[PDB]
Design a protein around this ligand. Sequence first.
Ligand code: ACO
Ligand code: ACO
Ligand code: CL
Ligand code: CL
Ligand code: CL
Ligand code: CL
Lengths: 173, 173
Amino acid sequence: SNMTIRFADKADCAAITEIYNHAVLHTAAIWNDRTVDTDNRLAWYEARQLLGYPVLVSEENGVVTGYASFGDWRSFDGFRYTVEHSVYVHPAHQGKGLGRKLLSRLIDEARRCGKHVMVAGIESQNAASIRLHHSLGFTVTAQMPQVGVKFGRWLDLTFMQLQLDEHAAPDAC
Amino acid sequence: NAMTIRFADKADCAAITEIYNHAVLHTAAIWNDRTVDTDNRLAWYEARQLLGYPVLVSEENGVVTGYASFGDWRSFDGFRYTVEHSVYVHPAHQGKGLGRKLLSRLIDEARRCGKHVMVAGIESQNAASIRLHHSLGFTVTAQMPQVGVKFGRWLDLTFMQLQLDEHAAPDAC
Ligand SMILES: CC(=O)SCCNC(=O)CCNC(=O)[C@H](O)C(C)(C)COP(=O)(O)OP(=O)(O)OC[C@H]1O[C@@H](n2cnc3c(N)ncnc32)[C@H](O)[C@@H]1OP(=O)(O)O
Ligand SMILES: CC(=O)SCCNC(=O)CCNC(=O)[C@H](O)C(C)(C)COP(=O)(O)OP(=O)(O)OC[C@H]1O[C@@H](n2cnc3c(N)ncnc32)[C@H](O)[C@@H]1OP(=O)(O)O
Ligand SMILES: [Cl-]
Ligand SMILES: [Cl-]
Ligand SMILES: [Cl-]
Ligand SMILES: [Cl-]
């Protein structure tokens, strides 16, 4: 059968690491300059599993073409219904609808996990990501000039968010 | 003469601790429910000092009446010119201009640390903190609904920021 969106396995972690490292080296999407090893992303993957948070891959005849996941925006208790997510498509497979397929599914999984808000931290010149999010119902709630640096230049940050329900705020426990 | 702003001493950490915990128990300024001990804030103070970051206190005839500090907004490399600060005035010493004196002084230290931007994470009902920041030239750059929860209600987040220089590009690696 053919492309699939599925939950990642531990064995996907090397493909994930390669995509992650490419984004570190070649995009303004990750505001760090540290490439990592397979075990780093394995530990990341496992921490997500422990919280029951999805790590998703897109695949075509058995090869990983992209990934998506979310985690807590911040570790403090008051943020426990807000997640910050990310989507990375292998550079050779970008512009083919995989980002929308991954994010669409991630939204479903966020609703399943009981989350209230998804937060996208997008570098302001990333028109593809801003459009991707717009098309899945996200709205711009921040525009923060010169709060990042990479490649020797200031970066601007756009926050976009999607509120997943209109429920009342939960109790303490 | 009766009142000063100064750098904090290790001996101020007990006073800082109780102001911090009061804010934990009774405000939406800290989106958590964990109170801390003196050693905890001691370590926090000492960690700020390793990075060359200020802890400041306001005092009146010897009594600590308020404190302010900043740290890295995020730990990733790309944020190394951006700090996130906080200011807390003792519950018995508010509305007397201490907030502004502390913040104004903290601004000077942020510049001395060569920072480009200060980010304030303010819960949107905190009119006092909003006014204070506006009075020192911060501008609102985010309005993010329902990203927190405390006290049975959704919390909304206002980001305000102040750009500290006009450098065209980062100037310190
Ligand atoms: C919160 C987020 O994680 S921010 C960081 C996102 N990741 C990155 O920036 C890393 C590098 N980029 C990528 O991996 C991908 O290109 C992504 C995730 C941004 C998008 O994934 P793709 O598979 O390329 O996106 P997809 O093909 O589904 O297209 C998404 C939208 O972008 C639009 N688009 C594509 N290129 C551009 C462009 N250059 N300018 C404007 N819009 C564009 C498409 O028309 C499409 O619009 P639609 O959804 O309204 O039809
Ligand atoms: C990024 C920030 O750290 S966000 C978190 C800030 N800290 C907290 O919220 C913790 C609890 N609150 C506090 O500690 C204090 O109320 C602070 C730090 C917000 C303000 O400290 P104060 O010493 O009261 O501030 P100060 O006397 O300088 O007054 C600041 C402004 O708020 C106004 N103000 C004071 N109290 C109130 C109030 N209850 N409601 C509305 N406005 C108020 C003052 O008029 C002044 O405004 P102006 O310049 O327009 O006249
Ligand atoms: Cl929008
Ligand atoms: Cl609903
Ligand atoms: Cl109390
Ligand atoms: Cl209360």
